[PDB]
Write an enzyme that holds these catalytic residues in place. Structure first.
Site, mmCIF file in Angstrom:
data_model
loop_
_atom_site.group_PDB
_atom_site.id
_atom_site.type_symbol
_atom_site.label_atom_id
_atom_site.label_comp_id
_atom_site.label_asym_id
_atom_site.label_seq_id
_atom_site.Cartn_x
_atom_site.Cartn_y
_atom_site.Cartn_z
ATOM 1 N N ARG A 1 -13.630 -68.497 28.398
ATOM 2 C CA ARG A 1 -13.983 -69.230 29.623
ATOM 3 C C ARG A 1 -14.344 -68.130 30.636
ATOM 4 O O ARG A 1 -14.198 -66.943 30.342
ATOM 5 C CB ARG A 1 -12.899 -70.184 30.160
ATOM 6 N N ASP B 1 -4.974 -70.798 32.408
ATOM 7 C CA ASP B 1 -5.738 -69.696 32.963
ATOM 8 C C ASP B 1 -5.279 -68.252 32.854
ATOM 9 O O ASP B 1 -6.085 -67.355 32.620
ATOM 10 C CB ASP B 1 -5.954 -69.973 34.451
ATOM 11 N N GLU C 1 -13.864 -67.894 47.286
ATOM 12 C CA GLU C 1 -13.398 -67.701 45.920
ATOM 13 C C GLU C 1 -14.585 -67.544 44.998
ATOM 14 O O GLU C 1 -15.674 -68.039 45.310
ATOM 15 C CB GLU C 1 -12.555 -68.875 45.415
ATOM 16 N N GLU C 2 -14.399 -66.757 43.942
ATOM 17 C CA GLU C 2 -15.415 -66.573 42.903
ATOM 18 C C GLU C 2 -16.877 -66.392 43.321
ATOM 19 O O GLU C 2 -17.739 -67.182 42.930
ATOM 20 C CB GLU C 2 -15.317 -67.759 41.947
ATOM 21 N N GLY D 1 -14.705 -77.027 51.953
ATOM 22 C CA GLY D 1 -16.147 -77.187 51.835
ATOM 23 C C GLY D 1 -16.800 -77.557 50.529
ATOM 24 O O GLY D 1 -16.424 -77.042 49.474
ATOM 25 N N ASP E 1 -21.322 -77.784 45.682
ATOM 26 C CA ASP E 1 -20.046 -77.591 45.010
ATOM 27 C C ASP E 1 -19.807 -78.862 44.162
ATOM 28 O O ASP E 1 -20.665 -79.742 44.097
ATOM 29 C CB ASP E 1 -18.900 -77.365 46.008
ATOM 30 N N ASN F 1 -10.481 -78.205 45.743
ATOM 31 C CA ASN F 1 -11.116 -78.245 44.436
ATOM 32 C C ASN F 1 -12.540 -77.677 44.580
ATOM 33 O O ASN F 1 -13.018 -77.419 45.707
ATOM 34 C CB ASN F 1 -11.119 -79.674 43.892
ATOM 35 N N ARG G 1 -17.756 -81.732 36.230
ATOM 36 C CA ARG G 1 -18.574 -80.622 35.722
ATOM 37 C C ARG G 1 -19.422 -81.166 34.584
ATOM 38 O O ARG G 1 -19.216 -80.892 33.399
ATOM 39 C CB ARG G 1 -17.657 -79.490 35.262
ATOM 40 N N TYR H 1 -18.828 -73.447 35.188
ATOM 41 C CA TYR H 1 -19.187 -72.344 36.085
ATOM 42 C C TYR H 1 -20.658 -71.919 35.935
ATOM 43 O O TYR H 1 -21.290 -72.200 34.928
ATOM 44 C CB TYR H 1 -18.313 -71.118 35.806
HETATM 45 CA CA LIG Z 1 -14.973 -77.047 47.530
#
Ligand SMILES: [Ca+2]
Ligand SMILES: *[C@@H]1O[C@H](CO)[C@@H](O[C@@H]2O[C@H](CO)[C@@H](O[C@@H]3O[C@H](CO[C@H]4O[C@H](CO)[C@@H](O)[C@H](O)[C@@H]4O)[C@@H](O)[C@H](O[C@H]4O[C@H](CO)[C@@H](O)[C@H](O)[C@@H]4O[C@H]4O[C@H](CO)[C@@H](O)[C@H](O)[C@@H]4O[C@H]4O[C@H](CO)[C@@H](O)[C@H](O)[C@@H]4O)[C@@H]3O)[C@H](O)[C@H]2NC(C)=O)[C@H](O)[C@H]1NC(C)=O
Ligand SMILES: *[C@@H]1O[C@H](CO)[C@@H](O[C@@H]2O[C@H](CO)[C@@H](O[C@@H]3O[C@H](CO[C@H]4O[C@H](CO)[C@@H](O)[C@H](O)[C@@H]4O)[C@@H](O)[C@H](O[C@H]4O[C@H](CO)[C@@H](O)[C@H](O)[C@@H]4O[C@H]4O[C@H](CO)[C@@H](O)[C@H](O)[C@@H]4O[C@H]4O[C@H](CO)[C@@H](O)[C@H](O)[C@@H]4O)[C@@H]3O)[C@H](O)[C@H]2NC(C)=O)[C@H](O)[C@H]1NC(C)=O
Ligand SMILES: *[C@@H]1O[C@H](CO)[C@@H](O[C@@H]2O[C@H](CO)[C@@H](O[C@@H]3O[C@H](CO[C@H]4O[C@H](CO)[C@@H](O)[C@H](O)[C@@H]4O)[C@@H](O)[C@H](O[C@H]4O[C@H](CO)[C@@H](O)[C@H](O)[C@@H]4O[C@H]4O[C@H](CO)[C@@H](O)[C@H](O)[C@@H]4O[C@H]4O[C@H](CO)[C@@H](O)[C@H](O)[C@@H]4O)[C@@H]3O)[C@H](O)[C@H]2NC(C)=O)[C@H](O)[C@H]1NC(C)=O
Ligand SMILES: *[C@@H]1O[C@H](CO)[C@@H](O[C@@H]2O[C@H](CO)[C@@H](O[C@@H]3O[C@H](CO[C@H]4O[C@H](CO)[C@@H](O)[C@H](O)[C@@H]4O)[C@@H](O)[C@H](O[C@H]4O[C@H](CO)[C@@H](O)[C@H](O)[C@@H]4O[C@H]4O[C@H](CO)[C@@H](O)[C@H](O)[C@@H]4O[C@H]4O[C@H](CO)[C@@H](O)[C@H](O)[C@@H]4O)[C@@H]3O)[C@H](O)[C@H]2NC(C)=O)[C@H](O)[C@H]1NC(C)=O
Ligand SMILES: *[C@@H]1O[C@H](CO)[C@@H](O[C@@H]2O[C@H](CO)[C@@H](O)[C@H](O)[C@H]2NC(C)=O)[C@H](O)[C@H]1NC(C)=O
Ligand SMILES: *[C@@H]1O[C@H](CO)[C@@H](O[C@@H]2O[C@H](CO)[C@@H](O)[C@H](O)[C@H]2NC(C)=O)[C@H](O)[C@H]1NC(C)=O
Ligand SMILES: *[C@@H]1O[C@H](CO)[C@@H](O[C@@H]2O[C@H](CO)[C@@H](O)[C@H](O)[C@H]2NC(C)=O)[C@H](O)[C@H]1NC(C)=O
Ligand SMILES: *[C@@H]1O[C@H](CO)[C@@H](O[C@@H]2O[C@H](CO)[C@@H](O)[C@H](O)[C@H]2NC(C)=O)[C@H](O)[C@H]1NC(C)=O
Ligand SMILES: CCC(CC)O[C@@H]1C=C(C(=O)O)C[C@H](N)[C@H]1NC(C)=O
Ligand SMILES: CCC(CC)O[C@@H]1C=C(C(=O)O)C[C@H](N)[C@H]1NC(C)=O
Ligand SMILES: [Ca+2]
Ligand SMILES: [Ca+2]
Ligand SMILES: [Ca+2]
Ligand SMILES: [Ca+2]
EC number: 3.2.1.18
Lengths: 388, 388, 388, 388
Positions: free
Chosen positions: B37, B70, B196-197, B217, B244, B266, B290, B324
């Site tokens: 992943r 994870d 993040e990321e 957001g 997102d 999330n 996703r 992702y």
């Molecule tokens: Ca978000």
């Protein structure tokens, strides 16, 4: 290029960071991973690799039955890429045998494998991937060597061998090789009463080896070698923080020149970095078995018989299996100091986990950090139940 | 040779052509493929390779059970040849850990892996395949980084890290490394409320990062870095075309300096190319999960709060799983411009497909074309039923 | 180094010697071999390798079910060492797609993969392992190319593409690339009425392509290209020795500028070496199916409409499955002439062997000898029963 | 670089040390190992590798059934890293065929593979990994060659071939190749009555070959070649210590120019180092079957018809299966002499172990030591029961 010279001193060890881990047993549950034991790590000028003694069979293969045994004609020293598992397809055989050592001198690598029956073993020294020298057993009782990397200085790579009893005095020799040829050999001298499986590292033209006294000592014997004079001395780590296994409980005062008594005819390959206040000792958590693993900073452990820990780091929980441990460093890294490193053999299977008929292991390895890093525990990770 | 400098601007993106696809889950149904992943792609001057975080087990292996988790001690950043699957035999471990980034500076590669328990993680920065620097957790709450390639300019390779809450304000830092050493670090500044990321790319001496605001957001936060001044700014993509997931339905006007509300705590790692009219946004088709993936040309998305799509391309049908996505480019290609590229992680298994006990993924990746090419959809391709 | 120039003429072909054979289906019965079809061979200046279109699954894997289908998102052009099988572990992906070609120009290699739905395919031309150019479908009906190596001369590598019907006139184009970029393209000219899957080779600055007229001809269309003038001509092999499959029985006189009638809308990729008296034709033994394979020396076949065989060599018995065949030569070999070579795709599974649900193949390949060598037959070798 | 010249004489052989062992059958019980036979070892200037004739199937694969057969279209000469097993993934095909030889001349390698039906075989000589020359069968009865490495001197690499009966006189030829081309060939001359499978080595500009007289002799025929004059002579080893198998019991006096009678139409490929007092003979322990293996120092064996052993070393116990054996040396090692080496093929399966339907083998190989080393026995190591 040119022979490497141990010109740097150790970096300050304020903690240990994760370096490599292969999860070999986990992965091998469903892929072609060779059964091994006696692993170690060793660097070339352009690459660092994992090393171990294969048992000449995969873990899931039917020939895995019986791999608790140490010396068979099917074993071989193999090396493979850092953190990969030892698979049938990515493993490179360095030499054939059941006891080994290996080190790069800056120009090329020397690998030594010993094979034979107990009373007629012989070592063959390979240099630049070719056999160059052979040494026949001198005591006719399991000629054996380090089981971790040797160290070189200006072409001279000393190696410690032992031949004879594992439960009484034996004949230990320090051989000084250069390009796979013997320059000289000495008998062991000093106060160490028994030597087996030395873990060595070098700094500022001195090679330090923390070995194992299988016969009587629960404290570790230490051999310091001058690779220029090609001479050495031997003693024990003075510290009351005992580092062999099995072992008695820690006293308040240790022994500098005699084995610390309490446990006979047993032990495990281990190591240490002896550098004044920058001294760190590795050891299993359990005093009874190869369980858990921790690093303890014991300032002046080698020479201070009342030295006790001032800091520490857990590597493997006492509820997980460990095993052998040894030293190595990347002598070809950038920087002004050598970063101390070590590996821990995580033994799975026999004799502790006898629901399976094999014995193997995976590897976890760390190196020092000048930072004071948070700690994690690093177990093998495999569920034996899956192998049933 | 010499450090690469971001001297070119992006090529005009008129459509996307197929670049790489490994069909890892399909193939892994009957071969030694590692469970992964958090994949990404990254180029060296002479090769482009797939990257991901292994789970230290094959998909068919019994240890695949539980890989929805994870962070474990069995994970590691691995890289393997473009479009091949991550197999036990062709995967190269870059470092050990459960969060990572990696980028080539023109001379050699820097790889960063973070490992540890939630309250005591640490990052170790490798350069030229050796550990050079270590950074301890500063907020004691899952130190984590990009999960896609970093970008370098004249030896300076900035990396965005976050430590602290995923559902409230956290401590994000931008570190500027050169040869694995820290030159400087800043705290996040600007209007982005949570980072993040980050997915980054560079052009004309500026590095753009499209990240994720996990806290509030549904529009994406953006960090633009000047790698010479070693300074940065932050805002959100102004566009009403929200990127997102999960997310609310698209409004007619977005937000430039505050998270667009509607969904809390999330999100998913994503990316974008912000280049005036040559602006393209990636996003899942579904606003709930996703699922699916599409590219939308939204001229001036970053600065125009009413910008809407003018062209688009479907990458994965809404009836297929995605995950992702991130950016990368081959900075060492011929030509006068950098060809924008991206990858989409095609997640299979848990939590959406729970008839199996594992979670893994395959990779599909595209790059831009100045032609207006026909489009196809690119799903993972595996039949879960086969794994039962 | 420098671009290769077709300066030599063909060596005299007095017989064919065994060059390479991978026994892929035999071996794949118990190892990780990828399901393929549309194989070919191609050389770099320092190595010759096998090539084919993978189906993105192993033969024994459950996803092998359905591989009779031609175009899916899971296919990719892969290359692997000469005579090894295409395994998950040794296969290198050149590009993603379901139709391809590839050739080395002396400096580096150009690979072309076409992917897409039937009405919206696109070709992407890779050079030096990077995507350089893209061409969108021009007839919206399965854009497709050679399925065997292209040939280069002084940097110019011509490639024949077809887009449109397979059972009526279509739009064939000859593209002239240099360093992956388009220098020029022409529409097909000459008397060939339909072109598909051209097999090419070069000698004395001329490139000859023996293709397939899927629409009406049982004789093969031929395209001769001048890579300097970047012009070409087209006709059919005049010979009554018909070389497509299926096909009618051989007449006593063939056709030079029209398809030889008798069989419509079908055929197989094939090849030939047209060199005056040094002319050799390959063809299946069966006139009804892809069964058997033989080489026939038919002096002046291209221009003599009554030419019949003067010598021959059986490659595969009529009691064994064959399939596609194509040309390649090692333009970087020593000597004063180019040694003609070819491969035969040995198709196993569907549709002829329907007890299994897959379709794959192995490869056998030969090159010419100036000696008059004894002959052997070279079948795939696998027992389908084992796969049940 | 430059062509190697046999300028050194042999090192003194005081014993044999372990060089390489692949444990192929053990490991192959659970991994993708190819079924082989007719193995040998051969060095390049920078690497030494194992070689053998694959059967085009893995041992565990269903196509392993029937591999007792010698000549099929699925065989190929393969080479793989020293001491690794021949796996589907690490094996490199040198050429296609069922009889072979191979040797490096200092600049590059020449490999020869013969394939065909019994009455129409042909050899193809590859040089620098390309086909250069072809030789058609001259007696139409299984053209065959050494099955072990050839030797070169100043670019000239002689090879011994035999075509015709295996149970009566045949047509043996010595071909002298240079860069894969034929410089000259002679018919066999001397007193050797039948020649098959020659094992060769070189020293001080002379090449010695110990072969096999399948027809009548239990003593071994020897061919000594002058690679400069490109001439040779032939005789038998005079010694009463008989080295073929099967064979009669040792007499007290042997034969120098006639086969030693007692056993007809049978034998095994074997070897010897003939060097005055530094003479060592290899042979199976059993006089009836390919069982066990030992080395015997028989001073002046070649020329002394009453020579008997003066020292010896057991390689494989008589209670273990052996098979073919041959010579090789690393002509590119350091030092002033060539270290004699040899390998023993450890045959497993049919015909001796018929509970399995396959026939394969593993390899064990030794080299000489000037030390007088302890001895160990080196069996294959696999348990057939596991394969049932
Ligand atoms: Ca978000
Ligand atoms: C996040 O990460 C950081 C970084 O790792 C974490 O902080 C670390 O925490 C570690 C655990 O606390 C700590 O390790 C210990 O360090 C001690 C030394 O420091 C203390 O003493 C010094 C000296 O006075 C003070 O300066 C300092 O301030 C501290 O007060 C060691 O003494 C500890 O080792 C001993 O305990 C462990 C169990 O914890 C034993 O396993 C170990 O063997 C040591 O104890 C045995 O040995 C001694 C010596 O003989 C005996 O006296 C003692 O009784 C024990 O003997 C029994 O057990 C052994 C082993 O089984 C047996 O052989 C014997 O016979 C007896 O049965 C320990 O190493 C780190 O130093 C600290 N690091 C840093 C930078 O701070 C932080 O906690 C993490 N955060 C969170 C939130 O988790
Ligand atoms: C062969 O290949 C070619 C090449 O690909 C094919 O041609 C392409 O076809 C594509 C599909 O038609 C096309 O893509 C679309 O482009 C639209 C923009 O172009 C049109 O508008 C401009 C601007 O005025 C005109 O200039 C132009 O001429 C066109 O008229 C996009 O608007 C499309 O995206 C929107 O629709 C798709 C569904 O199709 C959504 O998934 C997508 O998210 C977009 O719509 C949502 O978002 C907008 C913005 O907020 C909302 O307004 C709208 O209501 C949607 O909102 C809902 O859905 C989202 C997503 O689920 C959700 O978040 C939200 O809350 C709402 O629920 C689309 O991208 C290509 O541009 C075109 N390419 C070329 C070169 O022509 C050709 O067809 C193929 N041939 C064959 C035979 O098949
Ligand atoms: C050891 O090795 C050597 C080396 O290989 C072996 O010797 C070789 O043996 C081969 C087989 O004999 C031989 O191959 C044949 O060559 C023929 C040409 O030579 C002869 O004619 C010339 C010309 O006059 C003479 O100079 C010469 O001396 C000979 O007499 C070819 O004609 C042969 O091909 C035809 O037959 C085969 C079947 O054998 C067909 O499969 C093939 O397609 C050819 O026949 C069809 O096509 C022709 C042309 O249209 C038709 O007229 C004919 O009727 C056939 O048509 C039907 O079949 C086709 C195919 O199915 C179908 O499409 C059509 O509609 C009809 O149904 C053949 O190629 C080698 O040349 C020879 N090589 C050498 C160097 O000598 C030696 O035997 C081996 N030793 C041992 C002991 O085994
Ligand atoms: C640790 O390691 C060392 C190093 O290896 C060990 O020491 C070695 O020990 C070996 C075994 O003893 C020894 O090998 C033997 O050497 C003999 C020669 O030396 C002796 O004779 C010379 C000459 O006079 C003396 O100088 C010397 O001092 C010794 O006395 C060989 O003769 C031996 O080979 C013969 O015996 C073996 C069985 O042992 C047979 O298998 C072999 O084929 C030889 O015998 C057959 O052939 C001869 C010749 O034709 C016949 O005369 C005889 O009858 C046999 O014939 C039958 O059998 C054959 C084969 O099946 C068949 O074809 C025929 O028809 C008949 O049926 C043997 O090679 C090493 O040299 C010695 N090495 C060193 C350096 O010392 C040490 O023991 C080990 N330590 C421990 C504790 O184990
Ligand atoms: C390690 O130390 C030795 C000196 O003992 C260095 O050896 C000298 O190297 C130079 C260049 O090769 C020679 O000209 C000297 O003669 C060498 N040797 C001796 C033994 O005098 C060696 O270069 C040093 N290694 C490195 C990496 O600096
Ligand atoms: C990227 O930019 C730097 C200049 O900032 C280039 O660095 C100069 O390179 C030359 C040749 O190595 C040196 O003589 C200069 O001193 C270098 N550096 C600086 C920092 O002044 C670098 O070469 C550029 N990279 C490329 C690929 O052109
Ligand atoms: C193939 O032909 C071209 C000439 O058309 C050769 O190209 C010349 O090569 C030399 C050395 O690189 C240059 O100085 C000339 O300018 C080159 N090209 C042209 C187009 O004029 C090329 O070297 C030939 N290839 C080989 C292998 O000989
Ligand atoms: C092996 O012997 C030949 C001489 O027979 C050596 O060949 C000479 O090599 C030099 C350098 O390449 C040339 O200038 C001579 O003309 C070469 N050959 C002949 C045939 O005269 C060869 O170099 C020797 N090999 C080695 C490794 O020393
Ligand atoms: C020879 C005795 C020595 C000490 C007991 O044995 C070792 C102990 C071992 C152990 O304690 O695990 C493993 C080593 N593989 C073994 N060395 C050899 C050569 O067998
Ligand atoms: C051709 C006869 C010759 C001697 C009997 O056969 C060999 C014997 C063999 C053997 O005795 O094991 C194996 C060889 N693979 C075979 N050579 C060929 C070409 O098949
Ligand atoms: Ca398997
Ligand atoms: Ca002890
Ligand atoms: Ca046709
Ligand atoms: Ca015989």
């Amino acid at each position: 290029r040119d022979f490497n010279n141990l010109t740097k001193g150790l970096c300050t060890i304020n903690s240990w960071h994760i370096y490599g881990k292969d999860n070999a047993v986990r992965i091998g549950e469903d892929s072609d991973v060779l059964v091994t034991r006696e692993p170690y790590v060793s660097c070339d000028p352009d690459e660092c690799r994992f090393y171990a003694l294969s048992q000449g069979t995969t873990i899931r293969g039917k020939h895995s039955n019986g791999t608790i045994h140490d010396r068979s004609q099917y074993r071989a020293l193999i090396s493979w890429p850092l953190s990969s598992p030892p698979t049938v397809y990515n493993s490179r055989v360095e030499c054939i045998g059941w006891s080994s050592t290996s080190c790069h001198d800056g120009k090329t690598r020397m690998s030594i494998c010993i094979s034979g029956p107990n009373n007629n073993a012989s070592a063959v020294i390979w240099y630049n991937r070719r056999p160059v020298t052979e040494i026949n057993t001198w005591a006719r009782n399991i000629l054996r060597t380090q089981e971790s990397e040797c160290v070189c200085h200006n072409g001279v790579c000393p190696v410690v061998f032992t031949d004879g009893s594992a439960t009484g005095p034996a004949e230990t020799r320090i051989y000084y090789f250069k390009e796979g040829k013997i320059l000289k050999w000495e008998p062991l001298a000093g106060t160490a009463k028994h030597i087996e499986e030395c873990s060595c590292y070098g700094e500022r033209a001195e090679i330090t080896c923390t070995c194992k006294d299988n016969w009587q000592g629960s404290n570790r014997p230490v051999i310091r070698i001058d690779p220029v004079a090609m001479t050495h001395t031997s003693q024990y780590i003075c510290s009351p923080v005992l580092t062999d296994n099995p072992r008695p409980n820690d006293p308040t005062v240790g022994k500098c020149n005699d084995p610390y008594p309490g446990n006979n005819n047993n032990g495990v390959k281990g190591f240490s970095y002896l550098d004044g206040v920058n001294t760190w000792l590795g050891r299993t958590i359990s005093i009874a078995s190869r369980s858990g693993y921790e690093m303890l900073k014991v300032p002046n452990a080698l020479t201070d018989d009342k030295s006790k820990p001032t800091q520490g780091q857990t590597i493997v929980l006492n509820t997980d299996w460990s095993g052998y441990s040894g030293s190595f460093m990347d002598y070809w890294a950038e920087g002004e100091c050598y970063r101390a490193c070590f590996y821990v053999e995580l033994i799975r299977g026999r004799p502790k986990e006898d629901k399976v008929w094999w014995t193997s292991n995976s590897i976890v390895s760390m190196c020092s950090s000048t930072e004071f890093l948070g700690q994690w525990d690093w177990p093998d990770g495999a569920k034996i139940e899956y192998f049933l």
